[PDB]
Design an enzyme around this catalytic site. Structure first.
Site, short mmCIF file in Angstrom:
data_model
loop_
_atom_site.label_atom_id
_atom_site.label_comp_id
_atom_site.label_asym_id
_atom_site.label_seq_id
_atom_site.Cartn_x
_atom_site.Cartn_y
_atom_site.Cartn_z
CG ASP A 32 76.54 33.57 53.24
OD1 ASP A 32 75.62 34.46 53.40
OD2 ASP A 32 76.42 32.55 52.51
CG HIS A 92 72.28 34.20 52.01
ND1 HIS A 92 73.63 34.07 51.74
CD2 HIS A 92 71.63 33.91 50.86
CE1 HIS A 92 73.78 33.68 50.48
NE2 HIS A 92 72.58 33.55 49.94
CB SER A 420 72.67 31.23 47.91
OG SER A 420 73.32 32.45 47.66
#
Ligand SMILES: *[C@@H]1O[C@H](CO)[C@@H](O)[C@H](O)[C@H]1NC(C)=O
Length: 634
Positions: A32, A92, A420
């Site tokens: 990620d 994220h 996600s």
């Protein structure tokens, strides 16, 4: 998150959280944006030493100190050879790693929103971070390097909320496909996001049969700020407004299209003499919802109703000034009132975090990427759905909720939406199953999640699609919504190994050169002579997908079920819910397991009597249901 474990039915009383030991000693690799190590989700309070089996490390720097890694966060590497530190400047990476494996944090919230204890699904797991996502994007060469490195380091689970922006490349071109193929022989489970290009068909990515492809759905939570008009009509609204509350009073109401040069509330468009002390209605477009709030504020407005382009709401509007978001159709009612009424007024009633059975949940997210599988119609994708709409998890300390100049907010926990957010819920559940079932193959852990996944919402109707307000299909929800306590005890599994995957690569017509990308050797040109799968749909898979070439076509697939229940002497009977316009026959219709026969095969024949159609089969004994969805294309 502070509510998803509860929505999933996880509890300390019984089921997968206790039998999996909250993932104690399972290592989750997260591919990620990196991680924000100075965060309470990486607390290693009451955790044993890193086992010496772990061959991972922490790449250190001024920007990423040695003290970043501890007994909880045990790995941090960066992969930029495809075009700096594992530090997460986005948010994220912290959100996903923290959803999958975050230590318990008391009183977590976004300014009081989604207030509770934030827990990874595998709360006691170790986290290894592999930063592969940069401002330029996530390079294929770096994704494949990080997967191959996470395998060498000895993670148990790879959580990869990274994939194609739109329609997926073929398997041989996808890092995820090549990496996950290598991970299989080590028992490593690869959990991936299906992508965010829904609701249009064929958008699902990370669609290798050996990946657990995860779609996003809603939970039973809204972030509510309703509109009341002076004529007594009321409209649902959504807001994450973080500032001082608005007075509980009615204000004069005006539309930006009347009060200014732009219905879009662009910089300098509103006439202050028409919007002083007023709630201003702004239409979506050109600029962010929050940037419109800055214009209303500049011009002397009391608040803002933003009108979205869609007839559904998704929470995500971290307004710096009092505002709420309403649907296209509710917006026009409020607009038409503002223009035609003698003395139009409105109140925004900020209700905060609301948990309840209206609207029903789960629903497949409008944005969740959808099957069919673009490359292999005979493999249903995605595989499952999990919570992915307005999920509270960990955020970067170097990132504001918006890119507004006047946004200075630094938060430990942010609400975020995507496949996600869904993927790491599944990566955490998979960690739990790995601990409960150390001997299961990667395929058997996935099978267990699919054959126990549920298909009814909390109203008792088939799970709906946000995009249609109608029943979803397996192309939307796969085998259904993960049911972790049921997945602990699935009864049977559909098992598969690396050799089955080579037979699949042969079945889809890859030559020896392309197979060699996966197997990591130059195979002989005639390698596929040694594999006899036939249809790709004959790969032992927990779901069924049929592509009829003609109106009277008939297709037969083979499956093998393995008893993983505690009793060796168990009898299963099939029940068939045939798709409309398809006759389904299962042979045999009964399976008698014993110590001598722990694995049994069956054949299922699909006969067109006719476009797409759906149904299911299930095998049941006294305590277990082994359910498989059926998808039909003509
Ligand atoms: C194998 O397939 C690839 C991709 O379709 C192709 O470009 C290549 O020339 C093929 N090799 C042989 C020997 O046919």
């Amino acid at each position: 998150d502070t509510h998803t474990p509860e929505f999933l039915g996880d509890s300390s009383n019984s089921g997968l959280w206790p039998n999996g030991n909250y993932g104690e000693d399972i290592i989750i690799g997260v591919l990620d944006t990196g991680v924000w190590p100075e965060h309470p989700s990486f607390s290693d309070s009451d955790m044993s030493d890193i086992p010496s089996s772990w061959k991972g490390t922490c790449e250190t720097s001024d920007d990423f100190p040695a003290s970043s890694c501890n007994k909880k966060l045990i790995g941090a590497r960066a992969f930029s050879k495809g075009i700096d530190s594992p530090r997460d400047i986005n948010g994220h990476g912290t959100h996903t790693s923290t959803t999958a494996g975050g230590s318990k944090v008391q009183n977590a919230s976004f300014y009081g929103y989604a207030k509770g204890q934030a827990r990874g699904m595998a709360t006691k797991a170790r986290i290894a971070v592999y930063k592969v996502c940069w401002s330029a994007g996530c390079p294929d060469t770096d994704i494949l390097a990080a997967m191959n490195q996470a395998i060498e380091d000895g993670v148990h689970v790879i959580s990869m909320s990274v994939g194609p922006q739109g329609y997926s490349p073929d398997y041989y071109q996808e890092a995820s496909a090549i990496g996950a193929f290598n991970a299989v022989k080590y028992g490593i489970i690869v959990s991936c996001s299906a992508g965010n290009s829904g609701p249009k068909p064929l958008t699902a990515g990370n669609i290798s049969p050996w990946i657990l492809t995860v779609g996003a759905s809603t939970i039973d939570r809204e972030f509510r700020a309703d509109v009341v008009l002076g004529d007594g009509r009321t409209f649902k609204g959504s807001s994450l407004y973080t500032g001082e509350p608005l007075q509980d009073e009615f204000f004069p109401l005006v539309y930006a299209g009347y009060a200014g040069s732009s219905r879009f509330c662009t910089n300098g468009s509103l006439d202050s003499s028409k919007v002083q002390g007023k709630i201003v209605i702004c239409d979506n477009g050109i600029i962010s919802r929050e940037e419109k709030g800055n214009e209303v504020n500049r011009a002397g407005g009391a608040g803002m109703i933003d009108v979205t382009a869609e007839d559904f709401l998704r929470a995500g509007d971290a307004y710096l000034f009092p505002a709420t978001t309403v649907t296209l159709t509710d917006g026009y009612e409020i607009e038409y009132y503002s223009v035609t009424s003698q003395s139009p007024t409105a109140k925004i009633v900020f209700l905060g975090t609301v948990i309840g059975n209206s609207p029903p949940a789960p629903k497949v997210a409008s944005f969740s990427s959808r099957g069919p599988n673009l490359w292999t119609p005979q493999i249903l994708k995605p595989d499952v759905i999990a919570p992915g709409v307005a999920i509270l998890a960990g955020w970067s300390g170097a990132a504001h909720p918006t890119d507004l100049d006047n946004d200075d907010r630094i938060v430990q926990f942010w609400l975020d939406s995507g496949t996600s957010m869904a993927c790491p819920h599944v990566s955490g559940i998979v960690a739990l199953l790995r601990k409960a079932h150390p001997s299961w193959s990667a395929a058997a852990i996935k099978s267990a999640l699919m054959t126990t996944a549920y298909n009814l919402d909390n109203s008792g109707e088939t799970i709906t699609d946000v995009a249609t307000s109608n029943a979803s299909t397996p192309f939307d929800r796969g085998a259904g919504h993960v049911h972790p306590d049921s997945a602990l005890d699935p009864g049977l599994v559909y098992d598969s190994d690396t050799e089955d995957y080579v037979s699949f690569l042969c079945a889809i017509g890859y030559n020896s050169t392309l197979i060699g990308i996966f197997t990591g050797e130059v195979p002989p040109s005639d390698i596929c002579d040694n594999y006899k799968l036939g249809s790709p749909g004959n790969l032992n898979y927990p779901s069924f997908s049929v592509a009829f070439e003609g109106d009277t076509s008939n297709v037969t697939y083979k499956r093998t079920v393995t008893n993983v229940g505690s009793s060796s002497d168990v009898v299963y009977r099939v029940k068939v819910n045939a798709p409309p316009s398809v006759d389904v026959s299962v042979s045999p219709s009964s399976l008698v397991f014993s110590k001598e026969n722990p694995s049994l095969s069956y054949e299922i024949t699909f006969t067109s009597t006719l476009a797409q159609s759906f149904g299911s089969i299930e095998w049941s004994d006294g305590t277990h249901s082994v359910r498989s969805p059926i998808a039909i294309d003509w």
